[PDB]
Structure 1
């Protein structure tokens, strides 16, 4: 009726045409054999994929039952650990080994810096993300609360000089700290020149060079009156733009216009938790954006070209003007009716994504005929982040999938590299084996701490009531999880070979707090960590200039700072831990968060957006935070902390508040049960305990499809 038959598969026409007319041409893959391959791969790997999913359920049932047959609330760690081993949850750790992944770009093996993650369905965000390799420090400081909006220094309709001066001073201090002068301060600079290949900085009473002249990387314009000077520190570039006749330069002692930081070294184009894609139409819109990015012709605004510099000696060179791109595929769980078989059964979306995003990525290995000749991966790798994997057999399966896809695409084996999200408990406690199962493909491990927290709650759902959502970030289990991740990577030889990454900062308006606190991540040895915007990427870059990540990692070598016991420490709430008002606040906090997110997901197909919590702090959250909130209330409901009336009342109380915050928006109040979005939120909480591993996708997908079908009437 609207589907194309290929072997046992019935492919939605919109997807079939997209692949044939847009994805395949230029790849030199015969369409016939591609589609035959899709059918073969799906048929061969579907059974294993299903067996893996059934194994999760069998494990979770056994754990649930272990908790229900015990009364002793002080959990016996010795017996729990033995139980997990018996049932195959906790596997033996393999002998020491080193990863052998090759053909990986410098941005991944060597450079430490921010990693930006954006929804691929939003073409403009995606474009801005790709262009976010360079970002204005002045704009990041002026536009955020990193420079406090104190009296006199508030941002108005026009340039506030008092504020600008604070921005300038902040950046002079950064420069002093990052690329020190031999004597004196950048704050007192009057000019820059290049003399015999050395950077010279004029002070009022003298001239001076850098304390480390090798931090001078280049310049533009005349050496004796440069338009910019390029510095490098800890592998990251810093560009001072010189323009006395500019609106800012005119007020600056050296005529400096801006300081540009190399910011988002790598970007993850997300098909998973930050997007809403429930059918072939949604997937195509995403695939098309991924295609445009890899061909370099995406336009919503266009992709930046490379940056040209003059070397200290006077020669010419270029730096990449774009972030190196990963794509995040969906995980092993969900099916999607973009393709169905002859029984009407939907095909696994993870299998589809590997095939399609892998196909499309081939274009990023060829020179863009357009805004190029930017090759995404010069070293010939395709970078796919695989989320939500549970344990080493699931990693093995992703390997096999990637291997079979490479064959269908005619790519060399191991072309398709894997960024492993460590964001499920069964991966956390078997991490070394997981890395080993991908020892030839792995290019990162990353602590997806939000999903990890969700999995923590669901796995131990039957053990007792959990601590509040805000308490979770500082629990012993999570701190051990974070340290264990770093330790496993380093011991597997990631240093110099693969990224060790940490998680997302979600408080987009609290940039001063981000600058003060997120430095903890590179201090702990992470070579990269996630940010949600180009602005946040520029500000997080500051941290990699303050912290020598390579040195931190080498200082950590051989350390064993987390035990299996610490990892298995369930975040159970203590006896009488909350007063009535604290319980109410937490319920209201979670309900508002769920409703605010779900209404845009279900009604407008938006997978990530800003939602003010119970303190008005605007959070840029995605499905993972929804997973936490819904599981936490499900856990409180399961154990009698709150009643179903408390939840209902809270949802009904927060709903008009969420309608206010969104004032093409259809209001949830007052006809709650006429709102598909309101009912979805309720369902996420009330059925949370019965969702597989607490995953929210089954409900969101069902409800979004219901909504779309209504709008079609």
Structure 2
């Protein structure tokens, strides 16, 4: 065929081989029984999966027709959504009962990294990013300005280094204050009677709160490092007077190390391009290596844990790696990794649950067959499930997980669930969605891109929508952000599960990140997404300056969003825009699509630093495609713009995207032979067919074009 027959299934040999030879050994699950369970799970769960997808289509069909007869009566609109089953009754108050959850999630607040699992070295970097140098972060980025004269160059600018040092000293004052004086005047550190004691030029002092002293290394009389704790996060003062930086430091300090990326999401969904059996296996194989703890790539090796000395005691170890979640794909797509007897593809999410769940077994244990490094410490498996619509699709995820756990021979509720709030039918039924996963949920979060794509698609027929930039401050999205935090805290998330907020996408603009991203913890988010290990470290500053626990209890019991605000469709007003503004918005959207699409389709890259139309480096996932294509399809549908406008724009934008990828040998230009670039045709189709797509999802077209490209590369 060539495939492996097991019941109604025809399994791609690469997958069959990978599973039996690499993933199964060490798990004590008998191969023939694993494959029987797979057959059974797929046979039993496929019908309901399909039933859900159909229900999505029926609802959207009803809304499309409703809008085609029309301001908007919100009373009648709201009651329509209730009649059809879109808006469901808000259940009574409850508290989640999820148990066996790691410390990283229950108690601590901090940055959360996301990385495409298909890139080993990015995945490895993310795992080791649990601890990072603040000096390197401050020195290498624009947090410390190049004026003056702190300009960066080949040589080490000693002027810049002093700025870094002073910056770090201040942070210490702010986060672990001394009873008198400041770290900036320190001459040394000693450990007397299980207390940190700091040497001043005048006298000496202790911590204003001695309980913030976590541990140390070396002799108590002359420590090689000091370990501090604040708001659950650790701070390490590396002390070494013989160091280059140390010789010039008043107290011999070499560096300050911050606990940064507390948890990481290894991503199988929107940051990766994976359209067939071969791609899935490359992804499963890295997930395997991460869980074994033996993954290593050729630039290297997962960092082992960090050992310290307790204040008045023996040794203790702290986790050196970021706690790994995995984002499986959602309920939509199928993949040829497995087909049935009639040749139709199996649902890709069901597959991920089985395989990523199986592979995750190796991370619950350290052995010669399971590999040396453990992930979860409380025996959990953390799966973020994206793009769910409403509480019934959450319950289906519960059931899927529950069924997988039987096949894997795991205790029930082993497989925990991160509910991404990124679709409108979830937003407005959020409390119900959490309720359906009440014994499994460990995470909710919000974002911009997917949610705004769905916003636009759901109300496609209602009229033209505001510009993408404008969306970020519209009533619905402000309500959506608050209503998430509120639903969460009301379900008892504080001290139990993460409340997360979106990615900082501008990877070179770190000064701005430090200035503004502090808004997310101030809004009571226990975690938020960062695009790099450097960003994780800088964002960790915010959890020191903000007591997320304190903020969360202050927000307790508040109902800051109304259903009316959630349901306020972002229609543009009359007149609204001038020609030049319209063209500018089209260009920006065609550049966004083209810029991301060309690397996805031509090179199978789903996450990278893509310069936007103003050459700013952005790190967005595939959901950039959905928001951009839906906005244009919306503008197209209501005659704000034409198909020829869109094509003229794609043709204008293409050569810029081309020259923006000049430093690439494997890059192939889209201009001037437009109609012969699979990437180009993919970008054009995403728009002109955008309105027909199920909920505006881009994967159907995208996967097919990537398949088409790989097929032409087979000759």
Could you say whether these structures have the same fold, taking a TM-score greater than 0.5 normalized by the shorter chain as the test? yes
CA contact (8 A) 1:190 1:202 kept: yes
Unaligned runs of 5+ residues in structure 1 are: none
- Which residue matches 1:154? 151
Shift in Å, 1:456: 0.6
Summarize the alignment of residues 420-569 of structure 1 with structure 2, pairs less than 5 Å apart.
Answer: 420-569=419-568
Q: Which moved more, 1:246-255 or 1:623-632?
A: 246-255
Per-residue CA distance 1:132-189 (angstroms, 9 max, x = gap): 1101111111111111223421210121111111111111111111011111111111
Shift in Å, 1:575: 1.6
Shift in Å, 1:454: 0.9
Per-residue CA distance 1:183-220 (angstroms, 9 max, x = gap): 11111111111111111111221211111110000111
Shift in Å, 1:374: 3.0
CA contact (8 A) 2:363 2:370 kept: no
CA contact (8 A) 1:137 1:538 kept: yes
Shift in Å, 1:614: 2.1
CA contact (8 A) 1:130 1:323 kept: yes
Q: How far apart are the structure 2 equivalents of 1:568 and 1:511?
A: 35
CA contact (8 A) 1:295 1:369 kept: no
Q: How far apart are the structure 2 equivalents of 1:224 and 1:165?
A: 27
CA contact (8 A) 2:131 2:261 kept: yes
CA contact (8 A) 1:368 1:375 kept: no
Q: How far apart are the structure 1 equivalents of 2:594 and 2:693?
A: 18
Shift in Å, 1:245: 2.0
Q: How far apart are the structure 1 equivalents of 2:529 and 2:576?
A: 33
Shift in Å, 1:373: 4.4
Q: What is the SS of the residue equivalent to 2:166? A: helix
Q: What is the SS of the residue equivalent to 1:709? A: helix
Per-residue CA distance 1:290-312 (angstroms, 9 max, x = gap): 00000001077010101011111
Summarize the alignment of residues 196-215 of structure 1 with structure 2, pairs less than 5 Å apart.
Answer: 196-215=193-212
CA contact (8 A) 1:446 1:503 kept: yes
Q: How far apart are the structure 1 equivalents of 2:251 and 2:305?
A: 27
Per-residue CA distance 1:46-95 (angstroms, 9 max, x = gap): 0100010010011111111111111xxx2221111101000000000111
Q: What is the SS of the residue equivalent to 2:129? A: helix
Per-residue CA distance 1:253-291 (angstroms, 9 max, x = gap): 112111110001100000000000000000000000000
Describe the shift of the 1:27–1:511 C-alpha distance in structure 2 as closer, same or farther (beyond 3 A): same
CA contact (8 A) 2:506 2:619 kept: yes
Per-residue CA distance 1:613-661 (angstroms, 9 max, x = gap): 1222110111111111111111111112222222111111111111111
Unaligned runs of 5+ residues in structure 2 are: none
TM-score of the two chains, using structure 1 as the length reference: 0.98
Shift in Å, 1:449: 2.7
Q: How far apart are the structure 2 equivalents of 1:625 and 1:138?
A: 33
Shift in Å, 1:368: 4.7
Q: How far apart are the structure 1 equivalents of 2:501 and 2:89?
A: 25
Q: What is the SS of the residue equivalent to 1:383? A: strand
Q: Which moved more, 1:240-249 or 1:624-633?
A: 240-249
- Report whether the alignment pairs 1:297 with 2:299: no
CA contact (8 A) 1:297 1:371 kept: no
Describe the shift of the 1:372–1:21 C-alpha distance in structure 2 as closer, same or farther (beyond 3 A): closer
Shift in Å, 1:580: 1.7
CA contact (8 A) 2:629 2:690 kept: yes
Q: Which moved more, 1:300-309 or 1:363-372?
A: 363-372
Q: How far apart are the structure 1 equivalents of 2:533 and 2:16?
A: 34
CA contact (8 A) 2:294 2:373 kept: no
CA contact (8 A) 2:26 2:369 kept: no
Q: How far apart are the structure 1 equivalents of 2:660 and 2:51?
A: 44
Shift in Å, 1:369: 3.3
CA contact (8 A) 1:267 1:323 kept: yes
Q: How far apart are the structure 2 equivalents of 1:66 and 1:649?
A: 33
Q: Which moved more, 1:542-551 or 1:180-189?
A: 180-189
Q: What is the SS of the residue equivalent to 2:606? A: coil
Q: How far apart are the structure 2 equivalents of 1:58 and 1:200?
A: 68
CA contact (8 A) 1:635 1:689 kept: yes
Describe the shift of the 1:372–1:7 C-alpha distance in structure 2 as closer, same or farther (beyond 3 A): closer
Q: What is the SS of the residue equivalent to 2:218? A: strand
Q: What is the SS of the residue equivalent to 2:244? A: coil
Q: How far apart are the structure 2 equivalents of 1:474 and 1:245?
A: 52
Q: How far apart are the structure 1 equivalents of 2:167 and 2:230?
A: 18
Shift in Å, 1:391: 0.2
Shift in Å, 1:250: 2.2
- Which residue matches 1:236? 233
Q: How far apart are the structure 1 equivalents of 2:464 and 2:159?
A: 51
Describe the shift of the 1:137–1:666 C-alpha distance in structure 2 as closer, same or farther (beyond 3 A): same
TM-score of the two chains, using structure 2 as the length reference: 0.98
Shift in Å, 1:681: 0.4
CA contact (8 A) 1:502 1:529 kept: yes
- Which residue matches 1:119? 116
Shift in Å, 1:444: 0.8
CA contact (8 A) 2:362 2:370 kept: no
CA contact (8 A) 2:386 2:419 kept: yes
CA contact (8 A) 1:149 1:155 kept: yes
Q: How far apart are the structure 1 equivalents of 2:368 and 2:551?
A: 42
Q: What is the SS of the residue equivalent to 1:25? A: coil
- Report whether the alignment pairs 1:130 with 2:132: no
CA contact (8 A) 2:364 2:377 kept: yes
CA contact (8 A) 2:500 2:525 kept: yes
Per-residue CA distance 1:209-242 (angstroms, 9 max, x = gap): 1111100001111211111100000000000111
Q: How far apart are the structure 2 equivalents of 1:149 and 1:57?
A: 54
Q: How far apart are the structure 2 equivalents of 1:517 and 1:380?
A: 36
Describe the shift of the 1:352–1:372 C-alpha distance in structure 2 as closer, same or farther (beyond 3 A): closer
CA contact (8 A) 1:246 1:257 kept: yes
Shift in Å, 1:247: 2.3
CA RMSD in angstroms comes to: 1.2
Q: How far apart are the structure 2 equivalents of 1:233 and 1:532?
A: 24
Shift in Å, 1:370: 8.7
Shift in Å, 1:37: 0.6
Shift in Å, 1:513: 0.9
Q: What is the SS of the residue equivalent to 1:606? A: coil
- Which residue matches 1:371? 370
Q: Which moved more, 1:660-669 or 1:596-605?
A: 660-669
Q: Which moved more, 1:102-111 or 1:469-478?
A: 469-478
Q: Which moved more, 1:621-630 or 1:415-424?
A: 621-630
Shift in Å, 1:371: 11
Shift in Å, 1:457: 0.9
CA contact (8 A) 2:324 2:382 kept: yes
Q: What is the SS of the residue equivalent to 1:621? A: coil
Shift in Å, 1:445: 0.7
CA contact (8 A) 1:305 1:372 kept: no
Q: What is the SS of the residue equivalent to 1:440? A: coil
Q: What is the SS of the residue equivalent to 2:79? A: helix
Shift in Å, 1:448: 2.9
Q: Which moved more, 1:607-616 or 1:210-219?
A: 607-616
- Which residue matches 2:97? 100
Q: How far apart are the structure 1 equivalents of 2:32 and 2:613?
A: 55
- Which residue matches 2:613? 614
